[PDB]
Ligand binder design. Structure first.
Ligand SMILES: [Ca+2]
Ligand code: NA
Ligand code: NA
Ligand code: NA
Ligand code: NA
Length: 480
């Protein structure tokens, strides 16, 4: 069809999340019409060149005082929300509409929420690119909302009541439930399942209903590790989910949480990050590199975007396509391999994941159709080495450092005089100029070692050749 409007998102076959009309996850930043005009078309359009296909809208913020005299009633921002709906329609973006909280996160006004959805559910029912998220962070700070000691109580009743209102007027619109601020651990999943069972009993007549057009909205404020565990457990229990707010700072500040993004990508979960579309928002501008694009580029995170060519296509070679996790010490032993073969640089291409001065692999070995020059090695263990290493060349390897601290970085090298490298981690220099040992021959091998101090997380290891005159067999990174 010729309309730019996206088709309704649907649950994927795996029932892990909502995917769009090309099968791909929804990925996006946010904006707000809670006390401002709709973000301009030209600014919303920028999301498409940042790898996104979706926008989170905090449409209006609730008034705890409603319906008392002077209180702000739902519907006040209709003219601006209509513009966001129109602009995303035209731009070929998905839109997740919710109720925001202002200074009152971890709280809600049930009557206000019911009245908001009575007004807006019918209004955007037929807008196929639009999803409804019942209410942002309605309880301080996570499950079980169904507990009598939840702060405030009764949010599951609001979820039920609002779901019925939505489905009355918008029978086919995806609904995102709960919007838990802090969703962590096996415990968090078990507590959420209490809420889910209560909801299901009330609206479907069965605690164990199989949702066809609903998912659990959750946030990342338990931290990436604990959130990943809770998500994994909920997916195992058969309930799809959708990340709707997170950042790498309980803080919405600090930019993209690269670690949690990586896990969500692995698990097949759509996500909305807490960085904003210009001109304004409460946290950090998603178009500022330091809060999003540079975090992606430094880490090696990649996904196939609906629009444009960013992030560039790339990934790990070998290791099941997973970032190469660094070993740790447990009970006086190393938990896994410390060695990365040099010929296992990330795929992506010349100028992307490596740079080689000859477009052809002049060695012909191992990866003949990429540009790094590779030969069979005569070193112990056999296999392959990178050879014909020229000044200015570089090789990247996406790794994941489990623990921050000191590591021994070793390079297995062979060569003549005057060889030097410099090694970056997440585009930060960790070695300075490193004068490598001469061995007297291109197949006479030695191990050069230098201590580095690393931060945790997904990060690219980049070897920059500051000279020629050496071959490289492998890299080791070993915790001290
Ligand atoms: Ca070369
Ligand atoms: Na707030
Ligand atoms: Na080459
Ligand atoms: Na040397
Ligand atoms: Na090798």
């Amino acid at each position: 069809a010729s309309s730019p409007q996206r088709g309704r998102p649907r649950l994927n076959a795996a029932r892990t999340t909502f995917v769009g009309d090309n099968g791909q996850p929804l990925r996006g930043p946010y904006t707000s019409t809670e006390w401002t005009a709709a973000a301009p078309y030209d600014q919303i359009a920028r999301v498409k060149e940042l790898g996104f296909n979706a926008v989170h809208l905090y449409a209006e913020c609730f008034d705890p005082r409603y319906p008392a005299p002077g209180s702000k009633a739902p519907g006040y921002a209709v003219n601006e929300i209509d513009k966001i709906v129109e602009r995303t329609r035209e731009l070929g973006l998905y839109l997740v509409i919710t109720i925001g909280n202002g200074a009152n996160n971890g709280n809600h006004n049930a009557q206000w929420a019911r009245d908001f959805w009575k007004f807006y559910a019918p209004r955007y029912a037929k807008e196929t690119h639009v999803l409804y998220e019942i209410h942002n962070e309605p309880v301080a700070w996570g499950p079980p909302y169904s507990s009598s000691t939840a702060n405030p109580p009764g949010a599951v009743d609001m979820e039920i009541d609002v779901y019925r209102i939505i489905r009355t007027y918008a029978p086919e619109t995806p609904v995102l439930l709960f919007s838990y601020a802090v969703f962590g651990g096996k415990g968090g999943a078990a507590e959420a399942l209490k809420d889910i069972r209560a909801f299901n009993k009330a609206v479907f007549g069965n605690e164990n209903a199989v949702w066809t057009n609903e998912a659990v909205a959750f946030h990342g404020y338990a931290g990436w590790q604990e959130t990943t565990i809770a998500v994994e457990e909920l997916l195992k229990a058969g309930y799809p989910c959708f990340m709707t707010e997170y950042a790498g700072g309980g803080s919405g500040m600090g930019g993209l949480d690269v670690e949690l993004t990586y896990e969500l990508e692995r698990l097949g979960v759509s996500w909305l990050t807490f960085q904003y579309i210009p001109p304004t928002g409460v946290s950090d501008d998603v178009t500022k590199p330091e809060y999003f694009s540079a975090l992606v580029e430094n880490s090696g995170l990649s996904w196939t975007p609906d629009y444009g060519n960013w992030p560039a296509a790339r990934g790990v070679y070998g290791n099941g396509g997973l970032a190469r996790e660094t070993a740790t010490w447990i009970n006086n032993f190393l938990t896994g391999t410390t060695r990365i073969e040099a010929e296992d640089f990330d795929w992506g291409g010349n100028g992307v994941s490596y740079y080689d001065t000859d477009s052809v692999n002049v060695g012909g070995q191992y990866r003949p159709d990429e540009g790094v020059d590779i030969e069979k090695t005569s070193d112990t263990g056999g296999g392959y080495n990178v050879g014909w290493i020229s000044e200015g060349e570089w090789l990247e390897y996406t790794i994941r450092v489990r623990n921050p601290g000191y590591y021994n970085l070793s390079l297995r090298v062979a060569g003549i005089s005057g060889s030097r490298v410099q090694v970056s981690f997440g585009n930060q220099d960790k070695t300075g100029v490193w004068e490598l040992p001469a061995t007297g021959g291109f197949q006479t091998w030695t191990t050069a070692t230098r201590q580095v101090f690393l931060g945790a997380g997904l990060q690219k290891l980049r070897i920059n050749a500051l000279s020629g005159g050496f071959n490289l067999n492998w890299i080791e990174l070993s915790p001290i």
